[PDB]
Amino acid sequence: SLNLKELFIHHLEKNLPKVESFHPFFNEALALMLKAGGKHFRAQLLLSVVQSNKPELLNQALDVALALEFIHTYSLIHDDLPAMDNADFRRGIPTLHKSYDETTAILVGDALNTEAFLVLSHAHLKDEIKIKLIKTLAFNAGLNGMVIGQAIDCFFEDKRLSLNELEFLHTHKTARLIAAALKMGCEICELNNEESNQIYKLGLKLGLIFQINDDIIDNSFVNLLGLEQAIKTKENLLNECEQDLEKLNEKLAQMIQNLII
Amino acid sequence: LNLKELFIHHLEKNLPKVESFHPFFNEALALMLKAGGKHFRAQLLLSVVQSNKPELLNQALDVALALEFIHTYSLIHDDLPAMDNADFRRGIPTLHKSYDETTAILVGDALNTEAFLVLSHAHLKDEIKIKLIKTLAFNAGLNGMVIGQAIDCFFEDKRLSLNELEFLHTHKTARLIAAALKMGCEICELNNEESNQIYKLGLKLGLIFQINDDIIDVTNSFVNLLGLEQAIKTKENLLNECEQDLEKLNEKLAQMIQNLIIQYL
Fold this sequence. Notes:
Two copies of one chain form a homodimer.
Chain A: H1 4-14, H2 26-36, H3 41-53, H4 58-79, E1 89-90, E2 93-94, H5 96-99, H6 102-121, H7 127-141, H8 146-155, H9 163-188, H10 193-217, H11 221-225, H12 227-245, H13 250-259
Antiparallel strand pairs in A: 1-2
PDB class: transferase
Keywords: Transferase, isoprene biosynthesis, SGX, Structural Genomics, PSI-2, Protein Structure Initiative, New York SGX Research Center for Structural Genomics, nysgxrc
Assembly: dimeric
């Protein structure tokens, strides 16, 4: 029977990035955070789009999901560094800079960033599709998305942001990559630009909702707005999505409804 | 046609930036790109293109740009306190001194990813761009530059054999130099046989440059392992081999590479 979570986990475990060398632990360090855990939300968003539109491409989409998770994992490794979040644990295990050293954590993250593009470029898909996928990932994972969001999050931690600035921060830090996962699913399936763009825009909204939701369940929306208004902001957004959303296929729509959990 | 100036002008009008309320991220992105750099890797690539398909030279500038983005990101990360802990690079303070470590880490991360954005947007056929991305990500990533740097850092204070030292340098610097040449060939859709020969020449140049550095330092190292006499003899042997390899290239390309080599040495 079909289980996308298991399918991807097995794909990841069979395709860990590695290089033959006399370095005594680099391969182990590369694999560690990939194997340790991860809900693979971004991989699953992408695979859901593919399964709901062109299921015949599901196996070929696995490498694209893998590239997404390589980017996500590298980001976690760098963000956990002492200069930034300074985290001692991640995904149930010690962070790479604690198990090895800061150099290793920095370099493993660098390797995974670059390796995402090697894996994408080798995907079993037409070159025209792979170029679209690379554009989408590099735009949303790079300075136009994830990286500027992280830079803003770090720089303004000891400062104050307006609501609009806070929305900009989170939209870039996390929502862009979530939107990218959905859009890349559309691109694998060669969906029309209209639909792919609608799904991307929905992804941006879902990403913001996730961040506010997280702040609630607890640069925070609740600190800025208060709990009552934060819940109000989230609820509205489920609604804005609802209108926008209903246009996307009931098939995909329910799969997506589940992953948000 | 002055390829050096052509590329500098291209870089200066293609500095990566994003509109935001961050007070300095754009300036930090640009700082090391603008500050300096001999652009040796860019120039190797552009020389190949100019010599073979000059009608693609302008389109190739974006591919040269991607190479220099990778190279610059690597310098910024290598200069971090955890690694080389450098206070200056290209004549200015390092990013972690002018700004902070977080900025240096993230600017490097941005440039790594941006190399692929720029490459993917080049005005070249998608088939060519996929080949170029494969070449860059292989040679700049864990299969090349990154494993080279990890080895260099870990074994800085440990004894390496000659073969291990060769492995270190071939991965850390030679593979990206070879990639620059091979990427020029790929832009031109040069046959695999000549493209592979030119990649191998890049590997040799990379090794020659590192042996030359070890020799210059005394005037883990090749000199310590081989002795100054044998190290010089090895560099000279390798240079003579390169002379023969250059004779097998188009004469104009051979001269261009000779100029960039002599410049480097």
